[PDB]
Short mmCIF file of C-alpha atoms in Angstrom, two decimals:
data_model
loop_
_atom_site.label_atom_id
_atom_site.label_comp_id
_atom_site.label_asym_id
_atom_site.label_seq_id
_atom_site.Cartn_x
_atom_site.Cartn_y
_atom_site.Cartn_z
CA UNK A 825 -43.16 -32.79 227.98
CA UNK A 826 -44.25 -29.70 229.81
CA UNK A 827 -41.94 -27.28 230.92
CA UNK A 828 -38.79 -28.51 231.95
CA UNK A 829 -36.39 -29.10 234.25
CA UNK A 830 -33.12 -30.92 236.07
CA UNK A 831 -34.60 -32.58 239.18
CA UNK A 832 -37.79 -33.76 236.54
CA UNK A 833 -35.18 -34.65 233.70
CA UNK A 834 -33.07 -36.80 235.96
CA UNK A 835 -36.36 -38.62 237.43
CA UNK A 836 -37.43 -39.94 233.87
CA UNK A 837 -34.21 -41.53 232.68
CA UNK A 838 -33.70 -43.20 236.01
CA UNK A 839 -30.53 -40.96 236.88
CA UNK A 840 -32.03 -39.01 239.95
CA UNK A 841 -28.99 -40.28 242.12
CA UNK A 842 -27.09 -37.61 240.28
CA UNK A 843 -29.19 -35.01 241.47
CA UNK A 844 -26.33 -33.99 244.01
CA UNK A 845 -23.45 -33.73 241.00
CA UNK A 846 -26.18 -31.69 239.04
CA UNK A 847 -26.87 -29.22 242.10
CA UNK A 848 -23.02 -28.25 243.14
CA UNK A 849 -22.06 -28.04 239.16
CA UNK A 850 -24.98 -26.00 238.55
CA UNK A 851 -25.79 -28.24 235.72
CA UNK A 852 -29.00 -26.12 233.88
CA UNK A 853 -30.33 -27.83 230.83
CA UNK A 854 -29.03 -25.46 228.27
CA UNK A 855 -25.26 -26.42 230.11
CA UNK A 856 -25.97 -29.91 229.46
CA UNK A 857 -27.19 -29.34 225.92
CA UNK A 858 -23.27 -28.36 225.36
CA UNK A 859 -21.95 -31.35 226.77
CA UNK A 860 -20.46 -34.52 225.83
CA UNK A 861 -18.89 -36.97 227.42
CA UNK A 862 -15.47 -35.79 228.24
CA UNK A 863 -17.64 -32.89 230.01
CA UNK A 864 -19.70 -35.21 231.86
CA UNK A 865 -16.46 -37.23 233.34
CA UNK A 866 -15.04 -34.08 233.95
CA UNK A 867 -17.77 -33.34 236.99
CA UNK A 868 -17.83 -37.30 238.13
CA UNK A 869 -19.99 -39.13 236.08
CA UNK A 870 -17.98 -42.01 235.76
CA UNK A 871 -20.40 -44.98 233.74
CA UNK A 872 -20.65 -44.71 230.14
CA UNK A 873 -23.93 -45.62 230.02
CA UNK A 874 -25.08 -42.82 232.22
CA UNK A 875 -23.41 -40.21 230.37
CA UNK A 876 -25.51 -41.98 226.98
CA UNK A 877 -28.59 -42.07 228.73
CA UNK A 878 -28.11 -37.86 229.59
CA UNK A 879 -26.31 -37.01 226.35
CA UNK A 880 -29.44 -38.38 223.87
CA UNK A 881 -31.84 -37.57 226.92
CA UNK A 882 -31.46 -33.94 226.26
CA UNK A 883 -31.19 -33.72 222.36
CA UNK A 884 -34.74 -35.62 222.93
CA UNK A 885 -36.00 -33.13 225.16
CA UNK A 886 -34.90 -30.53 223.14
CA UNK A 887 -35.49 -32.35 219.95
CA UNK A 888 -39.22 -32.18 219.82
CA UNK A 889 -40.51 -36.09 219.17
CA UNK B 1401 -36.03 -56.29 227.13
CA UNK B 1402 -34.35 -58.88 229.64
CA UNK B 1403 -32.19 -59.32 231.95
CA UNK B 1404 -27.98 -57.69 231.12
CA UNK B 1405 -26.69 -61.26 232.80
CA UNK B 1406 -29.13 -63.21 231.34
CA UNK B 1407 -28.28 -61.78 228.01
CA UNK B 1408 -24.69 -61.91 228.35
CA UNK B 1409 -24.77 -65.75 229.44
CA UNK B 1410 -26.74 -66.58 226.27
CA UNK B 1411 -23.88 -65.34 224.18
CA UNK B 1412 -21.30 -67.04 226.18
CA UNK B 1413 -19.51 -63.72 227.04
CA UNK B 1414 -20.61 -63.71 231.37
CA UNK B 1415 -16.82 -62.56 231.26
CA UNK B 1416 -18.01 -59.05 230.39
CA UNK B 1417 -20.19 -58.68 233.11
CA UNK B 1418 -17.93 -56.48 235.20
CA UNK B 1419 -17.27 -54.22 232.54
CA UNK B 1420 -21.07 -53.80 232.04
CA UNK B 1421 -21.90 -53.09 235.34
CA UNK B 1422 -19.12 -50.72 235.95
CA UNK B 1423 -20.31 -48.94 232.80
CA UNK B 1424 -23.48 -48.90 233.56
CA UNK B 1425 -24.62 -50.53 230.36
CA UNK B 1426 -28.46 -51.70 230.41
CA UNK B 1427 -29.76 -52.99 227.11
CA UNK B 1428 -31.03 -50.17 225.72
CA UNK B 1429 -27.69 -48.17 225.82
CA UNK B 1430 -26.26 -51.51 224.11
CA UNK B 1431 -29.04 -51.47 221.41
CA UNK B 1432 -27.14 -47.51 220.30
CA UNK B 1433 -23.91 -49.17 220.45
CA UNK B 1434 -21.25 -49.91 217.49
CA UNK B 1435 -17.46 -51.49 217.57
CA UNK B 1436 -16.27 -47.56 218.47
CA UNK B 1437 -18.09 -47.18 221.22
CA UNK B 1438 -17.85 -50.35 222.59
CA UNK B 1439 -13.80 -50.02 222.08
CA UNK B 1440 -14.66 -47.06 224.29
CA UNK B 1441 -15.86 -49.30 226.69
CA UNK B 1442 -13.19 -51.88 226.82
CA UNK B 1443 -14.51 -54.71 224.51
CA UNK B 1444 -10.91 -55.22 222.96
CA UNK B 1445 -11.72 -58.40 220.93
CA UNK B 1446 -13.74 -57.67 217.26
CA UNK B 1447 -15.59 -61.16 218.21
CA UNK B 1448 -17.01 -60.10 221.65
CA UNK B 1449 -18.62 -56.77 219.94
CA UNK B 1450 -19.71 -58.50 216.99
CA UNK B 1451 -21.69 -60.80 219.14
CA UNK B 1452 -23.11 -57.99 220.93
CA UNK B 1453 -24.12 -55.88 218.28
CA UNK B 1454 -25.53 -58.96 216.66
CA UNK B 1455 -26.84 -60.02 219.58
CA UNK B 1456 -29.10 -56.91 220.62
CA UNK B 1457 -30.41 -56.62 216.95
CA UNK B 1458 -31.54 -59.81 217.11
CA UNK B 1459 -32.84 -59.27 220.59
CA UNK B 1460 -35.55 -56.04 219.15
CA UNK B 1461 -36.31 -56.90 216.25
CA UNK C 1327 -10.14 -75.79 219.31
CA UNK C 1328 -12.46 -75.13 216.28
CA UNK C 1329 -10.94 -72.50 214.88
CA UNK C 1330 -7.24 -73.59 215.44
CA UNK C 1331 -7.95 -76.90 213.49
CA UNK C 1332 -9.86 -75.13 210.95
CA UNK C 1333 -6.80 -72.39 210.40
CA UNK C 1334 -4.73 -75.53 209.91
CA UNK C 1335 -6.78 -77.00 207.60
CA UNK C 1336 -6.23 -74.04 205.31
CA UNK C 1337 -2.47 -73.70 205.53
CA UNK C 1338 -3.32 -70.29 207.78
CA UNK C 1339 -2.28 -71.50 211.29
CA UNK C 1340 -0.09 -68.14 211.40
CA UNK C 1341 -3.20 -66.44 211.37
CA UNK C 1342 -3.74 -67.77 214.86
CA UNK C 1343 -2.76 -65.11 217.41
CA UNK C 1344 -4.97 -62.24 215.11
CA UNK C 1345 -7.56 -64.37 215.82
CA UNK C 1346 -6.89 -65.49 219.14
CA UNK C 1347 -6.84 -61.82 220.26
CA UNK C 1348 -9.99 -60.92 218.00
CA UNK C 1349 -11.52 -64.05 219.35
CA UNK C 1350 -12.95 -64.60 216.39
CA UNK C 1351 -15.34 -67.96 216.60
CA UNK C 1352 -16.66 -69.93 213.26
CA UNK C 1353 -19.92 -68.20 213.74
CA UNK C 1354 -18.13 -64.76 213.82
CA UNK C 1355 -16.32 -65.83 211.01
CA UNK C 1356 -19.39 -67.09 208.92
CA UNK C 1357 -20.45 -63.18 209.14
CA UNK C 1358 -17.15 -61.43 207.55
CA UNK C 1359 -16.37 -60.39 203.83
CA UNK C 1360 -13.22 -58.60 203.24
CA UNK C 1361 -13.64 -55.63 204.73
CA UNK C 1362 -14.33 -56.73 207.85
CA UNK C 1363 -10.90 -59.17 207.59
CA UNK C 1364 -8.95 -56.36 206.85
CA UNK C 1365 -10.64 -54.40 209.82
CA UNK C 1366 -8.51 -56.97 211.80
CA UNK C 1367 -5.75 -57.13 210.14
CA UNK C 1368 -5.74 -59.76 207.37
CA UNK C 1369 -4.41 -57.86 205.02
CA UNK C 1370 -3.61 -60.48 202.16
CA UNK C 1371 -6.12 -61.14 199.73
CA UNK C 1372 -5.47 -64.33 199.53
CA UNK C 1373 -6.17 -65.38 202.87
CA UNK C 1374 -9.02 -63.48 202.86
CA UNK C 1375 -10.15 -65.51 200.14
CA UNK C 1376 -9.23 -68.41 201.77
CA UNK C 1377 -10.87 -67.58 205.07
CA UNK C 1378 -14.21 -67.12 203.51
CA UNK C 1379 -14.35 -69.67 201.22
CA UNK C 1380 -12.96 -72.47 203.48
CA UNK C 1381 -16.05 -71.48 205.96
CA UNK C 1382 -18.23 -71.46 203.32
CA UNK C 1383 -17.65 -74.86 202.63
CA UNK C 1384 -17.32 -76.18 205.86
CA UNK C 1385 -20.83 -74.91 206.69
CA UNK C 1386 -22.27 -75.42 203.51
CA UNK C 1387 -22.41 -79.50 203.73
CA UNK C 1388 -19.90 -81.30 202.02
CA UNK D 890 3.16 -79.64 189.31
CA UNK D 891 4.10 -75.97 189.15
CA UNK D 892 4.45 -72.70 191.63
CA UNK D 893 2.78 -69.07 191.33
CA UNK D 894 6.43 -68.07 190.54
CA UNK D 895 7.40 -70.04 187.96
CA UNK D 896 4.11 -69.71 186.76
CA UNK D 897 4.54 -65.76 186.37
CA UNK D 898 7.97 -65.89 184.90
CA UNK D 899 7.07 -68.55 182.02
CA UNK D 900 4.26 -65.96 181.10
CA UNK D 901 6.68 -62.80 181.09
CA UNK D 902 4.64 -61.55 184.05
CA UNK D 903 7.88 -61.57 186.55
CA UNK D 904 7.08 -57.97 187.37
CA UNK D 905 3.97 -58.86 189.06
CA UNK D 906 5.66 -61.33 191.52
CA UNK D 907 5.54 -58.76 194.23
CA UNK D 908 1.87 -58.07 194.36
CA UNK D 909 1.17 -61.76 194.26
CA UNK D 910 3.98 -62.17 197.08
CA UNK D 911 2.41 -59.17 199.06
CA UNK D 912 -1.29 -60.64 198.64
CA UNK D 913 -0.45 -64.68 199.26
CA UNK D 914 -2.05 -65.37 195.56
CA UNK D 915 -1.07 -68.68 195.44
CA UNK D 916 -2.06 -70.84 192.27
CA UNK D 917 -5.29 -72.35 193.76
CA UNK D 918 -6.44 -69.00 194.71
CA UNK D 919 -5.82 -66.93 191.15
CA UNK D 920 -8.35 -70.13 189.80
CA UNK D 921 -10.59 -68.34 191.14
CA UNK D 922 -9.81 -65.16 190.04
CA UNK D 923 -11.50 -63.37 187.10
CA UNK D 924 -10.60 -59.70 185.99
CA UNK D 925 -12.90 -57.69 188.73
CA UNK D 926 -10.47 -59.73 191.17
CA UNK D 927 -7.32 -59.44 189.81
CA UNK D 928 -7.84 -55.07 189.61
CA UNK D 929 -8.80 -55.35 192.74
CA UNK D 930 -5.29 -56.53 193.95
CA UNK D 931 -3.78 -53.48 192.04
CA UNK D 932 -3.35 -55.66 187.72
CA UNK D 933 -4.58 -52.83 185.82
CA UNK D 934 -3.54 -54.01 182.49
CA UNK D 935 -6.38 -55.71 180.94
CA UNK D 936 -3.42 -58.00 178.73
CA UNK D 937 -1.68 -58.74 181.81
CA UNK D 938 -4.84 -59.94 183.58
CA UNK D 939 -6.05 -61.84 180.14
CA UNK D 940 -2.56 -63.94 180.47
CA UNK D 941 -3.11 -64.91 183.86
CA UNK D 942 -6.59 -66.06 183.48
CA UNK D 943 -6.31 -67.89 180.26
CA UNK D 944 -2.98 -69.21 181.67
CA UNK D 945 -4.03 -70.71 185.13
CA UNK D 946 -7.12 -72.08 183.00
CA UNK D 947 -4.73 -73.58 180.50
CA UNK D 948 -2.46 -75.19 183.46
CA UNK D 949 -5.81 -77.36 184.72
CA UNK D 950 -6.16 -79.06 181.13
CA UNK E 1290 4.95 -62.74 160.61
CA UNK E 1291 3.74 -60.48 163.85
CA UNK E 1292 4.58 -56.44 163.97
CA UNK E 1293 5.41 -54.00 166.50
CA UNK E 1294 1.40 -53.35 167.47
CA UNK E 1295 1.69 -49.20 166.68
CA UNK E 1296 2.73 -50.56 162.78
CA UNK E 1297 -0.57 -52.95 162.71
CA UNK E 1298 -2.69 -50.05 164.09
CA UNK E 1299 -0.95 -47.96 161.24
CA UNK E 1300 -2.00 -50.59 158.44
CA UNK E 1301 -5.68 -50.37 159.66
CA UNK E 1302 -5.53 -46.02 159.68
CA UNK E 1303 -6.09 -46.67 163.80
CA UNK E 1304 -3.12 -44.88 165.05
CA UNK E 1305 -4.88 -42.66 167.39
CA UNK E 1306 -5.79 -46.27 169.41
CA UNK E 1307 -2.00 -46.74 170.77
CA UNK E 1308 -2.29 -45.20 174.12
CA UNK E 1309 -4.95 -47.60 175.00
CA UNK E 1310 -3.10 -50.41 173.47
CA UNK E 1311 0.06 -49.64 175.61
CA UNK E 1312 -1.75 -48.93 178.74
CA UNK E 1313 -3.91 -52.38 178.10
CA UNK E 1314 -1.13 -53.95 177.24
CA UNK E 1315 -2.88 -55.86 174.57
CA UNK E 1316 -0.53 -57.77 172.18
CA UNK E 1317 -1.90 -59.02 169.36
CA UNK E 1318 -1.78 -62.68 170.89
CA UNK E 1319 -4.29 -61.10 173.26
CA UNK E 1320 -5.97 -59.07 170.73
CA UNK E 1321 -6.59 -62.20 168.71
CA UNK E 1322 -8.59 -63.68 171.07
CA UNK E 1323 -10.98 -60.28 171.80
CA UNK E 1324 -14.38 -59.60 170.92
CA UNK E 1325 -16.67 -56.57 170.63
CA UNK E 1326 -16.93 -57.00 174.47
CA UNK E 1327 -13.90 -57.56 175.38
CA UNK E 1328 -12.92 -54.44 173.17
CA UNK E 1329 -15.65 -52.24 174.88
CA UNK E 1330 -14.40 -53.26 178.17
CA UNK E 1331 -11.17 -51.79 177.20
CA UNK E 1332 -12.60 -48.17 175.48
CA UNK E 1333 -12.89 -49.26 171.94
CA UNK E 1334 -16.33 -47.16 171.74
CA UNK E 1335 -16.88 -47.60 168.07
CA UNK E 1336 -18.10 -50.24 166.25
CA UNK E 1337 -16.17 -49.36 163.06
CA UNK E 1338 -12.95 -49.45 165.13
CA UNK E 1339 -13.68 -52.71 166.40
CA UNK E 1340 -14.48 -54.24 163.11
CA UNK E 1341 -11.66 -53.53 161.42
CA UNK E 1342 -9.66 -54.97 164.79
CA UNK E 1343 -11.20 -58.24 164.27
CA UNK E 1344 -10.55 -58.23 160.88
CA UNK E 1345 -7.41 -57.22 160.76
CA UNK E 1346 -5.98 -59.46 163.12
CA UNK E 1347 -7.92 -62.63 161.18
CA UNK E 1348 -6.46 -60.75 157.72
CA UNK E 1349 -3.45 -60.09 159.38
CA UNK E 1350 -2.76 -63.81 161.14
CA UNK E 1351 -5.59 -66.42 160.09
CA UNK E 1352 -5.22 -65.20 156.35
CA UNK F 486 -18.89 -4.00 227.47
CA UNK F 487 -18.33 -3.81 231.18
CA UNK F 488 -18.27 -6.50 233.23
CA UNK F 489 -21.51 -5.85 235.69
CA UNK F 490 -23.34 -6.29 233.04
CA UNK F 491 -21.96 -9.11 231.07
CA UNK F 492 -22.61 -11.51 234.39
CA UNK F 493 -25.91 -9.86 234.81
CA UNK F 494 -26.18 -11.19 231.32
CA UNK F 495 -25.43 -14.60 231.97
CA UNK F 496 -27.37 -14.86 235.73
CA UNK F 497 -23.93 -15.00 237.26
CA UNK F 498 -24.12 -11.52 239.37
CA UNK F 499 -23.56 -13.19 242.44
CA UNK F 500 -19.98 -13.17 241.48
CA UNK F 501 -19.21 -9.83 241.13
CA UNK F 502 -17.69 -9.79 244.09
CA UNK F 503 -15.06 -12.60 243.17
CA UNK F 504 -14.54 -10.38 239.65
CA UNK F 505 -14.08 -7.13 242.23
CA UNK F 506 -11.34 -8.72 244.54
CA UNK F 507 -9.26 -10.72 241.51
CA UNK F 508 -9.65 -7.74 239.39
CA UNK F 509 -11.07 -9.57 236.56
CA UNK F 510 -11.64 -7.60 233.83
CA UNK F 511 -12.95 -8.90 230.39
CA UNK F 512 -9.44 -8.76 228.33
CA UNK F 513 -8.35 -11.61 231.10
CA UNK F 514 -11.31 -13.81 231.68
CA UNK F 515 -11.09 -14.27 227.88
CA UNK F 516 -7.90 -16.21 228.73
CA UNK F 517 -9.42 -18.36 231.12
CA UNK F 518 -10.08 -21.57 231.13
CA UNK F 519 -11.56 -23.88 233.76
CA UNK F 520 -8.42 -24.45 235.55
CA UNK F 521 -7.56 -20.40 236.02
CA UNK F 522 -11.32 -19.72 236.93
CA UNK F 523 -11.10 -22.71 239.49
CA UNK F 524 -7.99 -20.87 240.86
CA UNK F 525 -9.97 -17.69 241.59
CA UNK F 526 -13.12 -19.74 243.47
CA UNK F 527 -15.63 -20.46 240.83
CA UNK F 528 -16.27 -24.30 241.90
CA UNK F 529 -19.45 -25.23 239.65
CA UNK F 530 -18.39 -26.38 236.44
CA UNK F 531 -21.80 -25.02 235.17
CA UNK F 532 -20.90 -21.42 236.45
CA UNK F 533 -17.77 -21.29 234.88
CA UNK F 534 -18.88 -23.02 231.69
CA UNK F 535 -21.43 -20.19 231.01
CA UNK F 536 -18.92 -17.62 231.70
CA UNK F 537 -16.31 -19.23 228.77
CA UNK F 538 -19.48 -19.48 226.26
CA UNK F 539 -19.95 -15.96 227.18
CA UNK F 540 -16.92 -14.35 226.66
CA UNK F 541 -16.30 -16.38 223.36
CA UNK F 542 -19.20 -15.20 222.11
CA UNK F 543 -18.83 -11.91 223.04
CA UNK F 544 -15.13 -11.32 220.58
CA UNK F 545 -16.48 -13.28 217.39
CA UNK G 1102 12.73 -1.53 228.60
CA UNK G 1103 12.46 0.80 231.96
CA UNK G 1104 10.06 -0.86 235.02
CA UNK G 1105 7.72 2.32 234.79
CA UNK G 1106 7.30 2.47 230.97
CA UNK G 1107 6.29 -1.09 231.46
CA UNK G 1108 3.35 -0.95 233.84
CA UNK G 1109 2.00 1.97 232.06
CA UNK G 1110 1.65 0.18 229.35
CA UNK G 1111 -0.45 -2.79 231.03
CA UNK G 1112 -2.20 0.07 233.37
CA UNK G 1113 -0.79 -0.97 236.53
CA UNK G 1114 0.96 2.05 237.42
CA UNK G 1115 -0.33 1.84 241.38
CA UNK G 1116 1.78 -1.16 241.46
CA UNK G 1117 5.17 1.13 240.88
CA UNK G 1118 5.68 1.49 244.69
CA UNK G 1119 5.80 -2.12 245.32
CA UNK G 1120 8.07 -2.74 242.42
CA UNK G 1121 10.55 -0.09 244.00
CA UNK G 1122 10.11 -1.73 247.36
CA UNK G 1123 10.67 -5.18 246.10
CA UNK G 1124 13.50 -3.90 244.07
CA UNK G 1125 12.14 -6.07 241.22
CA UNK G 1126 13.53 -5.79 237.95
CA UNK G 1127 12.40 -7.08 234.63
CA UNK G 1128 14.94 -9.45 234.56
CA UNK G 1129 13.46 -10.80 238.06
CA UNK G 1130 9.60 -10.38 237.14
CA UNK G 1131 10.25 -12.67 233.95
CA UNK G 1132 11.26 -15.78 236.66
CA UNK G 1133 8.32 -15.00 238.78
CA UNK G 1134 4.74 -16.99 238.35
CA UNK G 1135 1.81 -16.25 240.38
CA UNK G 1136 3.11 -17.65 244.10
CA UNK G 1137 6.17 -15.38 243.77
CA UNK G 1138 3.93 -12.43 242.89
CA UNK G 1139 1.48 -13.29 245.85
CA UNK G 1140 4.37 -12.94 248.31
CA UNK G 1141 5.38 -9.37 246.92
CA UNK G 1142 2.04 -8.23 248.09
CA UNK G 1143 -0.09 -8.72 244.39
CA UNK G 1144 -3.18 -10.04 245.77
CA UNK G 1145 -5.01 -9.48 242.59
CA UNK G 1146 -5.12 -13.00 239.66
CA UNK G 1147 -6.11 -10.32 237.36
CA UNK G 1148 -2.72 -8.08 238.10
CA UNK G 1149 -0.59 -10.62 238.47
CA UNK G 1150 -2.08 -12.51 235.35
CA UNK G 1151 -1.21 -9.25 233.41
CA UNK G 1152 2.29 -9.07 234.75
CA UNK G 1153 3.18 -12.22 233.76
CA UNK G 1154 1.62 -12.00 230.14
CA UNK G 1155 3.12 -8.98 229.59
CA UNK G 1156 6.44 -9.68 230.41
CA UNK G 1157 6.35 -13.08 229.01
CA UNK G 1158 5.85 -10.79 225.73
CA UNK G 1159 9.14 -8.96 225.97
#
């Protein structure tokens, strides 16, 4: 909603556990925006369904609905 | 909507229950899921993901 | 064995391991057309054609 | 009675036997057949499938 | 007595019809039993050519 | 371009030092990939992300 | 091609002296990756990235 970012992202999907991948990858928004999920294995995020739930996260963010 | 075991044991598939919680896969993330992306996932069999897929719709709507 | 005895019953008991591995139950079955037999790898008409009609009738009451 | 063979050879339609061989038309299945069917499984001729038709209807007098 | 089909076609001015007849593969045993239907499924587009078809295969055969 | 300001560019000058020692100029990190910039120290896959969008961009 | 025609052209011309010392030929320098260059004293990925693209050319 109103001015975004990681630590607030990762609190409303339920995926604030990854807070410490995000923080030492230097994961910004606009970084994850480019991502899929090849990228997201790539720095350790190993369940599908956490990958889903940050890949259409962020295109909803973004998105504007 | 429910409960990811609960689900799973009313389509007689409590097999896949390891897969799902490795994966991570809640209900919702199930509900955006077709037969590629649950290959991704493992589910092998055409039968197991048609029962999911039909399964979830079912479930929301 | 429901869907072994109904493969038999048709003449397509060599379909078995195809749907063994696809684990494909009646109520699965009840669902396909031919695209979604060939998906797994039926890839004669015929027993396409077989397929659905024989669980047509078998559902279908009589 | 009669095979899908046989059948094809006593209408001059021996050609076709290895379409019907690859898609397991056996006689009770091309009963069923009319001519959306039968270009389906690759008989574009509309004479060739008019034999087949007429003939497998002929063959259940 | 029954003709090579291209020599019927030629009796009825309908030359210009063999391709489809050879691609159809339409004898006149088949043709015999056609219709204006059957005939459109097959590209026969005018009525006129149809007609004489029909007619010229009862001429030709029922006589 | 020069390479101060290309990471000044993408918030990255706190590696110019790393740049300065390897003698990375902008003709070679253009051949770098993750594995090569890993090699030379930059650990966050975010950092070193941003600096192959950047260079990609930059030769169009 | 002569050793001092050939980091002119890649602008590594301050590297001549440890060539010399090294006694390394082209013929050498083509079997050489970036631990090999590393012991000869090229500290720099950037040099020794050049070097081996260069040579890898020829």
């Amino acid at each position: 909603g109103l001015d975004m970012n990681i630590s607030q992202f990762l609190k409303s999907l339920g995926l604030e556990h990854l807070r410490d991948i995000f923080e030492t990858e230097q994961i910004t928004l606009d970084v994850l925006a480019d991502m899929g999920h090849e990228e997201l294995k790539e720095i350790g995020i190993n369940a599908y369904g956490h990958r889903h739930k940050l890949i259409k996260g962020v295109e909803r963010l973004l998105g504007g609905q």
